[PDB]
Amino acid sequence: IMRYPVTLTPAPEGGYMVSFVDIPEALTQGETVAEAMEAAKDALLTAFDFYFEDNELIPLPSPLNSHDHFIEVPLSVASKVLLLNAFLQSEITQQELARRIGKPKQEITRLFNLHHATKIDAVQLAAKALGKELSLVMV
Amino acid sequence: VEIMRYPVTLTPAPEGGYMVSFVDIPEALTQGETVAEAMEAAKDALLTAFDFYFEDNELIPLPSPLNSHDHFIEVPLSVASKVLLLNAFLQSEITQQELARRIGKPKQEITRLFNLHHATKIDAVQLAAKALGKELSLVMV
Ligand SMILES: [Cl-]
Numbered sequence: 295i296m297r298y299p300v301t302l303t304p305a306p307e308g309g310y311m312v313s314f315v316d317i318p319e320a321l322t323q324g325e326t327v328a329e330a331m332e333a334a335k336d337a338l339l340t341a342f343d344f345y346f347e348d349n350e351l352i353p354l355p356s357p358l359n360s361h362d363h364f365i366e367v368p369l370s371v372a373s374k375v376l377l378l379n380a381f382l383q384s385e386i387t388q389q390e391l392a393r394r395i396g397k398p399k400q401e402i403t404r405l406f407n408l409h410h411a412t413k414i415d416a417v418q419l420a421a422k423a424l425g426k427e428l429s430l431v432m433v
Numbered sequence: 434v435e436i437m438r439y440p441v442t443l444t445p446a447p448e449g450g451y452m453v454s455f456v457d458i459p460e461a462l463t464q465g466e467t468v469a470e471a472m473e474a475a476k477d478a479l480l481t482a483f484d485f486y487f488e489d490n491e492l493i494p495l496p497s498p499l500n501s502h503d504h505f506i507e508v509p510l511s512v513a514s515k516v517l518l519l520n521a522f523l524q525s526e527i528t529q530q531e532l533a534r535r536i537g538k539p540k541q542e543i544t545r546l547f548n549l550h551h552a553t554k555i556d557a558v559q560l561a562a563k564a565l566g567k568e569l570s571l572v573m574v
Contacts, residue, residue: 295570369555369571407569412512414520414555427436430510431570432517432562 296372300334300363301329302327306412316353317341338365339408342375346406371408372416373428378406383392384424394423434486437513439496441475445467454508457494458482464474475506483549492520502507514558515549517569522547525565553571 303311310330312322313367314337322337345352352375360363367375381391382397392402404410405420421428439455446452450466453475463478465471486493493516499505509518522532529543538543545551546561555569562569 310574369559369569372571373555376571380573385574394501411554413552414514418510427574429436429572429574430513430517431434431435432521432574433570 296355296375297358297369298338298366298367299358300331300365302330302363312337314338314341316356319344327363331365333362336364338367339371342371342408346374346378346408349382349406351379354379369414370412373414374405374408374412376428377417377420380421380424380426381406386424391420391423413424435496435498437508437516438499439508440477440499440503440505443481443504444472453478453506455482460485461506466476472504472506476484479506479508480512483512483519486516487519487523487549492523494526510555511552512549514528514555514569515547515553518561518565519547519549520549521562521565521567523558527565532561532564536560 298314298316301313301315303313309323309325310327312320312324312330314334316367317338317430320334320341322330322333324333342352345348386394388402388406389399392399395402395424401416402420404412405417418428427428439457439461440454441551442454444452444454446464448464450464451468451471453461453463453471458479460482461475461478463474465474470473483493496505500547508559520552525532527535529547532538533540546553546557559569
């Protein structure tokens with residue numbers, strides 16, 4: 295389950311500095327632990343936007359300890375994060391991925407943008423074009 | 434931990450065309466005039482069988498392990514997510530009305546959430562699974 299561990303460091307001027315061991319550019323702040331953790335979510339989603347825009351691999355979460363603070367990624371985002379990494383490892387072009395799925399090139403663009411709504415079934419078709427299988431587990 | 438693929442056998446149908454039998458789903462038994470029509474009928478009949486189990490307050494049975502050589506009918510993630518949710522709903526022993534109160538939605542939105550023919554966002558299925566104390570997660574192999 296995709297959970298990014300968060301580091302809270304008391305800020306000298308008050309509040310909590312937010313960092314991610316796995317996500318080096320995600321740096322933010324809140325007055326309280328609760329507000330810091332809500333700032334943390336926005337910083338992680340903004341850092342993802344940059345990895346998608348820059349065509350760079352998104353580092354996976356380090357395993358949690360019992361007491362860790364974490365940000366949980368919802369399945370909409372997690373599906374794309376898995377897809378982006380599988381796409382970049384494949385070294386195919388977006389044109390080639392479109393050709394394999396059998397869709398216009400425009401329709402593949404949404405796959406690599408966290409703010410366009412995309413059916414999980416279209417993410418699954420893309421994963422299959424790259425020789426990968428996406429599956430669901432219920433615990 | 435695997436892809437949701439129901440093993441089927443395909444044989445000549447005694448009254449013409451081809452029959453598709455599911456190891457795991459007696460009610461998904463189907464026929465078509467051509468091999469192609471029988472395999473597409475088997476995809477439709479599988480959904481209709483899932484609805485029967487739900488309407489009967491019974492668990493949808495999960496696939497048996499495949500073989501190298503087995504034919505199968507693969508359920509896409511949209512439908513697999515709702516199959517997992519419907520079983521977890523039945524196991525939860527709460528009413529639809531109680532689920533609707535936990536997620537803050539009118540009852541009518543639960544009716545559509547549980548309809549295997551209705552498109553539902555994977556994030557709304559995950560919110561519903563959480564309201565039943567369950568975690569839905571994605572694996573890529
Ligand atoms: Cl979806």
